[PDB]
Structure formats: structure tokens, C-alpha cells
């Protein structure tokens, strides 16, 4: 049973929860709340590079989010069936992660900048990303980005889109394919559950989380 | 023959040149110098997500540096021989990239901050990274980080270490294993060449590059 190390919040660990969940893998969590708990962690030589996310899985202590996600994907058929597949998934993933980031950084912005920034997400999404995906989808008619099966790209995309919708509720408006895709995915049972209550799915970060994060580091 | 799109400078494309070179793969370059050349590129629908690096390879237009490096690695046995291997390489790579970044951002700093920042690289390297590697090496006695063969992790590490040494010439001092490793690697012919003159190996970014970069974007 995979163990997740991280503060209790979304952060960067979210995508991990997301994948795990989708894979229908149950896992546990050990929360950081202090610099000190962190210290012990590092002190124990648990964090390969002194930082979290760290995930204990398959007798390993994985670090590096991308690294981790790739592991799990590979452990559960979320990584395609060949190089070409793999390759796409990969790029889709990296690109998305780039957008997701804005979300990730958001909370630590100077409230004033927070706003400007929302507007910016909106534009990148609309302009840079959503279109790519819409097209892909539009052009193969399948319910998955790649190879007619759920992949890592789908989960990150989903993750992100929702997250974005939390800030810009209508962002999808011009992307009827993306809308459909989103719906269906969310219907996948694992996901459906994850989305439901009492999931390890974290909420949008609050003042506290931030504080704490600032505290731990 | 792979074609590299990017301004004429190191930037993030460097690691690509590095890997290509090490793989002993010849490739070409198309330089960006203007917003406009960029526009056409995007206009043509060449940049999957509107940005560079972009690399034309194997009839593809790869984008996302990590994405690309993984491709090439996979095309040339720089990615290990199994999941466990792969997995390490991956993490080593991600971690290194994190350090390399400092280098990457460096030039665009307010000269005043540039200095503070050097000091910081020094510390992270010394404290966070170098030690991990030294240990690894120290503990298996091999000339490669992973599986007794050159991998992607080795190239990025090399890349970075040198780059760092360009700013903090003695950074390696306390890491006799890392020193040895570095030497030997640099002796690998491909590399040796890459390091020699008339290689596609770019130099440390100058005022111009910066300017240009600022210009293109």
C-alpha cells in the first residue's frame, strides 16, 4: 500500500493521488506539518534529494513527480502500448504539467497578482492547450487521447481541466469535444469515486495550507 | 538528420545537443533570431504547444525537453535495460535538471542577484546533489551511474557539472569519485569530440543571446 509523503494539501502530490486513484490503487498518507517532521524524513535518508513528493511504493522511495507518475503508469498500463504511443502521452503530459503549474503556483502569489494570473491561465489554456486536445479528439473520435485507452495523459488533462474550471468555470465552453471527454472520463468508476466524497482527493489550498507550507520550508 | 529549432545559444536545447552528441548522432540547427521567425514556426503548426525546443526527428516534431530526451535515450540505449534501471535514471535525471535550472535561469537575473545565485548553486550542488552521486559511484565502483553503461543520467550529470565548474571551478573538490567519473566520461570519444572544437556545443550565453532571447519573446 503506497505511502505518500507530503503536507496535507494538493500541491504537486495531487497528480499522484489522481493517478493512483484512477488506477484504482488504494494508498496512504503521512502528512508533513513541520520543518522538523521534514527533518527527520531527510535525516532518515528517505528523500533521495531532500525533498517531497516522496512516495513509498514497491519497496522504493520514489521522488520526482514526473518520475513517480511514470512509474505508476508503467505499473498500470497508463503508459500506452508502444513507443509512438508512449511518446505522445509523454509530450501531452509534459505540456499539461506546464499549464497545471500555474495552478500550482497560484496560491503563493501576491493576491494582487493572483488575479492577473487567472486571466493568464485562461488564455494559455484557451490558446495553447485546449485546442490541441480538442483537435486530437475531434480527429479520431475516441474517448481517449491516445490508443483508445486511458493513459496518463488523460488523467493529468482531466485533473487540470477541472482545476481550471474551479477558477474559470466556463473555460471549456468553446470545447465541446473536451467537454464530452471530460464527462465520460469523470464517469470512470475509479475516478467517479475519487470525485465523490471521502476520497483522498485534496481541495483547493487555503490560507492554512499555505502557511503550513511556508512553515515546513 | 535531426533538426533543432532554437535560438543560437545554450538555453534548454543544450541537453539535447549533449545527448545527441554522446549518442554520436549528427544533427542540424535552425536558429531563431526573431519574433517573426518564431511566428512562422508557430504559424506553420510546427510547435505542438507553440514553443521551442522543437526537434524534428524521425519524422516527428518533438517538443518538451524531457520528452525529447526520453525519446532519444530510448532510441539509443541511454535509458537502461529495465524498469528498475529506467526508474533510477529517470529520477537522477529529473533531480539534475532541477539543479541545471539554476544555470539556465542565471543569465536572466538582475546582475546583483546573479551573484547570490552562484553561491546558491554551489550550496545545492554540494549539499543536495553531488553527494548522492558520489555515494552511488562510490558504492559500486562502476564508471556509470546506472547498469555499467552510459545512460541519460550520466550525460545530464556531466553536462551540469561542467557547467557548474564554469562558474565554480572547484565545486568538485570534495568529490574525488565525481572527479574521476567526470574525467572518464569526458574521455568517451563522442563526448571527447563534443568537448573539442567545432562541435555544436554552445557557449555560455552572452549579452547578445539574452537580448535576442528577449527579442524573440
From Swiss-Prot, chains A, B:
Compartments in which it is found: Cytoplasm
UniProt cross-references to Pfam families, sorted A to Z: GST_C_3, GST_N
Reaction(s) catalysed by this chain's protein: RX + glutathione = an S-substituted glutathione + a halide anion + H(+)
Entry's EC annotation: 2.5.1.18
InterPro entries xrefs: Glutathione-S-Trfase_C-like, Glutathione-S-Trfase_C_sf, Glutathione_S-Trfase, Glutathione_S-Trfase_N, GST_alpha, GST_C, GST_superfamily, Thioredoxin-like_sf
GST C-terminal domain residues: 82-205
SUPFAM superfamilies: GST C-terminal domain-like, Thioredoxin-like
Top-level taxon of the source organism: Eukaryota
Family classification: Belongs to the GST superfamily. Alpha family.
Entry protein name: Glutathione S-transferase A4
Organism from which the protein derives: Homo sapiens
Amino acid at each position: 500500500r503506497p505511502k505518500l509523503h507530503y503536507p496535507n494539501g494538493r500541491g504537486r502530490m495531487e497528480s499522484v493521488r489522481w493517478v493512483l486513484a484512477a488506477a484504482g490503487v488504494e494508498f496512504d498518507e503521512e502528512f508533513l506539518e513541520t520543518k522538523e517532521q521534514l527533518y527527520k524524513l531527510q535525516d532518515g535518508n528517505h528523500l533521495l534529494f531532500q525533498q517531497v513528493p516522496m512516495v513509498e511504493i514497491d519497496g522504493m522511495k520514489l521522488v520526482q513527480t514526473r518520475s513517480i507518475l511514470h512509474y505508476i503508469a508503467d505499473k498500470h498500463n497508463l503508459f500506452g502500448k508502444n513507443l509512438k504511443e508512449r511518446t505522445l502521452i509523454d509530450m501531452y503530459v509534459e505540456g499539461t504539467l506546464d499549464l497545471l503549474e500555474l495552478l500550482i503556483m497560484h496560491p503563493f502569489l501576491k493576491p494582487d497578482d493572483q488575479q492577473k494570473e487567472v486571466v493568464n491561465m485562461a488564455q494559455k489554456a484557451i490558446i495553447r492547450y485546449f485546442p490541441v486536445f480538442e483537435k486530437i479528439l475531434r480527429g479520431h473520435g475516441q474517448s481517449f487521447l491516445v490508443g483508445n485507452q486511458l493513459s496518463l495523459a488523460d488523467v493529468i488533462l482531466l485533473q487540470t481541466i477541472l482545476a481550471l474550471e474551479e477558477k474559470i468555470p466556463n473555460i471549456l465552453s468553446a470545447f465541446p469535444f473536451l467537454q464530452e471527454y471530460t464527462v465520460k472520463l469523470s464517469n470512470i468508476p475509479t475516478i467517479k469515486r475519487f470525485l465523490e466524497p471521502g476520497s483522498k482527493k485534496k481541495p483547493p489550498p487555503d490560507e492554512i495550507y499555505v502557511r503550513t507550507v511556508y512553515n515546513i520550508f
